[PDB]
Amino acid sequence: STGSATTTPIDSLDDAYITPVQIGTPAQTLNLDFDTGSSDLWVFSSETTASEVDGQTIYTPSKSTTAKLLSGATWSISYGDGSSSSGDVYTDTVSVGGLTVTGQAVESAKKVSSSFTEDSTIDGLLGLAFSTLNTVSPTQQKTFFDNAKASLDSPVFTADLGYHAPGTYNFGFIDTTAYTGSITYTAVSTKQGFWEWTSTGYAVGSGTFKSTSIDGIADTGTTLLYLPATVVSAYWAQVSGAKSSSSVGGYVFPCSATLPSFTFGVGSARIVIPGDYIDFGPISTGSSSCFGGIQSSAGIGINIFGDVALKAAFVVFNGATTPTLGFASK
């Protein structure tokens, strides 16, 4: 089997991407944030504290003839941005782009933090990291991908995120029309539960490539590109007037600037992030200070190849017995 679904930016900045997901019988369609940096499929629901729901579409398990309470199971997650959610668990039928999993753990939120409430466009998350990170207790649950894997034509999914445009998540096949040139595959460590890999270096604009190993994670659920302070300083030094602002929370730059591109290495291959992808717009409405899309990972504890990086590539998440990651230009 295979599945193919369109993923759509939630706003004009590509702050996140939502993908429609069918849950239950009859189907209830919710727009979920597919997150290769976590491993829980959780939704706003009829059980979510009413004051914490503000415009989201909710899952109502009592209206699904295939829903079953997973008795005694609870979940609780905290994300790198400080947001969180928790609740109880149902199993139900879940379909993405025509690919159906029966008995999927659907984690129903009783509580969500303010950032979730305030984002009316995201109805929940669909985790695509390794199932070892799943938070359900006392019986850990599998991701949608892990449940689907054996039925897939090939044990893979691909992320093809758009810049200020829709893109695609495919399951079970590699669309050879969706990228240019060849796909370069690189080793993955699953030791921390992430799609963790090592970039071979970087370049800023038309500058020379610096060969240096940068360990980090491919994370579709993180907006920006978080890299070591040395790398990030080298980038922003090429933008007149750019500076790190502790009050704003990262590098800002004059909105009048033209940003240079940023290249990252994948083995001997190179992925080029155009300068425009690194512009996250005014820090507040009407400001002439703009927020940068490349930020320091110092104090995160890990480097993150988030959407800024991934949307410059066609990305293969290869879930074979020994997982790997592939990157192609597009």
From Swiss-Prot:
Biological process annotations from GO: proteolysis
Assigned keywords, A-Z: Aspartyl protease, Disulfide bond, Hydrolase, Protease, Signal, Zymogen
Domain of life of the organism encoding this protein: Eukaryota
Active site: D35, S199
EC number annotated for this UniProt entry: 3.4.23.22
RNA-binding in keyword set: no
SS bond list: C255-C290
Catalytic activity: Hydrolysis of proteins with specificity similar to that of pepsin A, prefers hydrophobic residues at P1 and P1', but does not cleave 14-Ala-|-Leu-15 in the B chain of insulin or Z-Glu-Tyr. Clots milk
Gene Ontology molecular function: aspartic-type endopeptidase activity
Domain annotation Peptidase A1: ranges: 17-328
Keyword Transferase included in the entry's annotation: no
UniProt record similarity statement: Belongs to the peptidase A1 family.
Descriptive protein name: Endothiapepsin
Organism: Cryphonectria parasitica (Chestnut blight fungus)
Location of this fragment in the whole protein: 90 to 419 of 419
